[PDB]
Symmetry: D2
Subunit: 329 residues, 4 copies
Amino acid sequence: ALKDQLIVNLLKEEVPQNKITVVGVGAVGMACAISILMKDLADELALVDVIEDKLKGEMMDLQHGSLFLKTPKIVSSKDYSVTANSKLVIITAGARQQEGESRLNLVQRNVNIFKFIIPNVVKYSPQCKLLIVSNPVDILTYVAWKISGFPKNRVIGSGCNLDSARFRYLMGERLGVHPLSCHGWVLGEHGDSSVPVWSGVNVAGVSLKSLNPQLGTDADKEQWKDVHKQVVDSAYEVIKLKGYTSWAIGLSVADLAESIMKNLRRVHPISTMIKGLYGIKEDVFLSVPCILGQNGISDVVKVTLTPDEEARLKKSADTLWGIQKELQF
Amino acid sequence: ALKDQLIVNLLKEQVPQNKITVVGVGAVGMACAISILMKDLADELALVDVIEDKLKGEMMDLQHGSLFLKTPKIVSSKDYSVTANSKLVIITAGARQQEGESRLNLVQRNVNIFKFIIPNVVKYSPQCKLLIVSNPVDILTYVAWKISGFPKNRVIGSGCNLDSARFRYLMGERLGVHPLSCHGWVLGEHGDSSVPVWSGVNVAGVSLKSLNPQLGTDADKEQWKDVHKQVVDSAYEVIKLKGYTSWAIGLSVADLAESIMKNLRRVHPISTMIKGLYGIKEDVFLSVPCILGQNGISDVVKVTLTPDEEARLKKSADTLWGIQKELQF
Amino acid sequence: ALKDQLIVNLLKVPQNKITVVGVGAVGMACAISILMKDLADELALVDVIEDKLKGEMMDLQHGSLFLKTPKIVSSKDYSVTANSKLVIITAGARQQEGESRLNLVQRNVNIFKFIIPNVVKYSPQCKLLIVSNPVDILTYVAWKISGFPKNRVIGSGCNLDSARFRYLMGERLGVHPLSCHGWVLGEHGDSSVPVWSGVNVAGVSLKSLNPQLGTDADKEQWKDVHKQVVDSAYEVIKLKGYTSWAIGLSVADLAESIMKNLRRVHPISTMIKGLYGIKEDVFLSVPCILGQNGISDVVKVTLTPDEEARLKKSADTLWGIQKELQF
Amino acid sequence: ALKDQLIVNLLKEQVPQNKITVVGVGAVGMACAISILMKDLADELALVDVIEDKLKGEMMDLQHGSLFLKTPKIVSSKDYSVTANSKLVIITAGARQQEGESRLNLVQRNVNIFKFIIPNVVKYSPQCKLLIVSNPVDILTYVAWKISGFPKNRVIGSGCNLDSARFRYLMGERLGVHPLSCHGWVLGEHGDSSVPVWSGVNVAGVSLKSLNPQLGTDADKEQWKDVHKQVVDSAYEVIKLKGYTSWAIGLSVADLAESIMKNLRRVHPISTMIKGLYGIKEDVFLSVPCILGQNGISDVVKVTLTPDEEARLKKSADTLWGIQKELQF
Ligand SMILES: Clc1ccccc1-c1nnn[nH]1
Ligand SMILES: Clc1ccccc1-c1nnn[nH]1
Ligand SMILES: Clc1ccccc1-c1nnn[nH]1
Ligand SMILES: Clc1ccccc1-c1nnn[nH]1
């Protein structure tokens, strides 16, 4: 054999150390995959879906770029054995928003799919962190948690990481400052009931509300509330124009993957249990600022909300809980 | 204005210094775009296409990921004024091959679009290099060169950079070595007449043909010719499975963009004029190994091919010339 | 030639060139950090110690396989620096054990009378990034000698002090420094001003949770964190003889914003004449928007009366030194 | 407490997953440290040395740059418990060669130091690879191997990775090509008896010796043998000029660290046992091309040498073996 003429093998080796699995090879799944590949986060990437031709085609297309990457093993299968020993399993599969459709409209359809997916993930990577991206992401993080049996620190929703990224982009465009230097937090549901925390919006520690006490109100002369409205509408607008969203959510998820895989303990607004916060007493999942690392969510930042901000957050909690509390599973 | 309360302007405001344009926001174009964005190659990215909604949607989706990137301005329009001052313009627009269709079948459709695209690009980006990705890439590089009035060094076809990356991936899989340490060139047409240069295939400077002189012939017991066959068929197989190719070509183009933008003077197998080499007398464009930097292709490596390999390269040239000489534009 | 047998030539200025002046520990740390961040297509080194300069260039050159900066050059002759987009000045007397950076000022003003006109001659449109100490005064000096408009004369300032502050805060809170926000302004030195009023995590003001934060009345004495920021260079100099790595990374951070036109906000040395009544040409750190044209805009911070008083005192200290210089 | 007002803890600490230790905080050790930090290879970096002030000062200086890095824990101690759970331990401590002094002259000093370092370093890290950088590196890789009792796949010397990087740089300068596209191996001792393998020196798979059969001989009109002489003399030229070498070796070591930490299975010329190749019957360590990944050196490439190249490699082996016979364990 040519291999043996060329190379002397010293030992038969064993398991990857930084393996990531993406479930679902739709547009969101593949954008997560490419972003993760380009950020050199994993030594092995596994893809899983039930559409076998599409799965194999996507795997091959990624594999053919291997020379340009530093992820030496890319694999796929409908069989979850291919996902064994993942540090992080990212769930993106399921029905996706159509034009004008609420993410909440996907709920029972994707719960039903999660009934198959989650036990199969848990079977082969019982120690992984789960990162839920499928919608509605907050409710589906709750579902993944209940079905998996995992402790809550290891079940994370991509949540409002993207909503906040959008907010900071839009704010940066208004101010002529890079989004990295524009700070502001969108919390609650990843969806229509999200909550902009105007009191925390700043550049260089300078509160925009301290310059404009009417920031975010209807009395705001510059209508900054339209920035949050743009955040809310963004996915609908993009779906209308190009049929789906992919690039921004792929980057958002890869950002979360990086914090987890590299144990950074950065703060992200991501989906977790908020029972005990703001007088909430049920197992509601929604985005609050969380310290994210190698053990998932280890700590939550207690954001000081104004009475109105707090009321909006509980309204978001209420909306999610009404659906979550009656799920069939 | 809130902005003026927050910020004192000290300097009247901008011309981009490392601008990249991608023409075409189909799957190849957007794969080039995300790959270029994730490699921090540009300070401005412009997108141009003729489908307005798709174009705006793609632009917006990339923009929403700006927090996670280091490319501070992302713009788009059907108006080529948006592409002004580009250092690199990447042409991906045009018809793409269906299942069972040669890239050579696209030539009439894509020559006719290039008649419009190329003069518009050159109008606003007089310092750019042109990187042709649209197919058939070898003929279209010739066409772009003739239309543009650019010197041949500044008109580059993505060519066999991808075919060679596929070859090296496939070889590495067989050998249990990373593609980076598996060396081998596929030259000629980016298409069915490409040539595997078996004579130069090596690991750590060890020629695989010296270990197995039957390498790449039908008498080869390990059938390494199947590797080149897989390279030839890869686009077709992937199109059969997922409907199109995107990721691998995106990465290949980003690789070439890196060498250009960073003046690396790395060697790539890319489309350039080969008149004067291997007895070729006409203005044939095809892939040979070229030194690639800030002024495009500055130098061509004269590969020492075996008689069969050279015969195969001349046949590739003959095939392209048959089509090329019949073009009217 | 073998080259001509192998290669057919078809074509007989760098676009993203950076020069570092001074190949001391600070300069070389800036050099290696810029190389590993892929900011430049050419790196030029300049110093007056010729063997040291050549050796550092060669040592860097030998790692070229592992870098993406295809030309690394050096000379005592400033012609090597032509066409620089960014020129980083790190040369001069460096801070000594148990001594203020202000103790270096006259010697470094004198060297800047030689360096700056040489830089300006070969790259009249570069941005100047001053790192040599005392950086706030030397930024003013570079500005006066160069004749450049103030946007193109930048001092590394408190970018490092703020990084140190955010590291220490992060260590106290169990959070990455990226998620611990807070600004140190004024002098890059003993009179720096921690802006406790702006310190936050996830937009939550720490001062809102501890109104006395950073004052003597602070039961948890977070003032000790700023004292650590002030003392850091002195401690590191005492322990290893100089500082290099942190400042190299801080400088590379600024060079990234400039070279990539990011328009991020950094606390860096610029003219603050006008701010808080200040009537003289004092340079010190305030939050600045930094990009391809240098400092285009300044963020107007809202300091408490305490913080305002401390910043004016920093301005007074620098001016007191600066007024008695001559060049 | 402010921390408890701000943050709600939800979770009690796992082991680091990608920890690297560097032993020795001289110029080589710190160049390794900064290079590794800037390549995002580790989640924890530990430094060990016996000079306590210098050690603490270097640690602090790195720590202060943490905002600009993605390595969330940097630690140091004279006590080796600080190195616990390392995946890679890099040994740079020891005497260094003076002008006119062979690296081989360092052997008794550095063996005596290794008698202390090696048992201490392996004590706390069951999963570590040992990467030896101290000189004479080949001899000291053998020494580390004998003292540690590790399997040979886990004991690696930085070897000729730098010598080959230098060779490729100088070749690139001669040809006007990036060193990435200039291929060629310097093997054997990292020192005076190294072997330039002319037979493998190529660009784009084109053998330079095939264009000039006199390449690297005294009859070479272009005196390519001087390139190899420059490689041999390089450390001494740099020591003569700046007092020591640091940056190049730092980058070389970080390159090896990358292959190991990311399981890349790239080929590098690094110090390993070559008993069984080229008729060598003793436990000699020297540089040959090795496949490097998460378990160290899993495979060795059997390079095809000319009779003269083989004779030169055996001479290098004889020289190193002679020094191994001087070792006093
Ligand atoms: Cl991947 C997947 C994607 C969509 C629907 C269902 C599944 C599934 N996973 N395990 N069984 N079924
Ligand atoms: Cl962008 C473009 C995309 C597809 C077809 C044609 C064009 C075009 N460019 N200039 N005029 N038309
Ligand atoms: Cl590089 C330099 C470094 C240190 C001192 C002086 C100089 C200088 N530059 N021009 N003249 N002298
Ligand atoms: Cl770190 C070290 C560095 C240099 C010399 C000796 C040592 C040592 N290690 N264990 N005991 N002594």
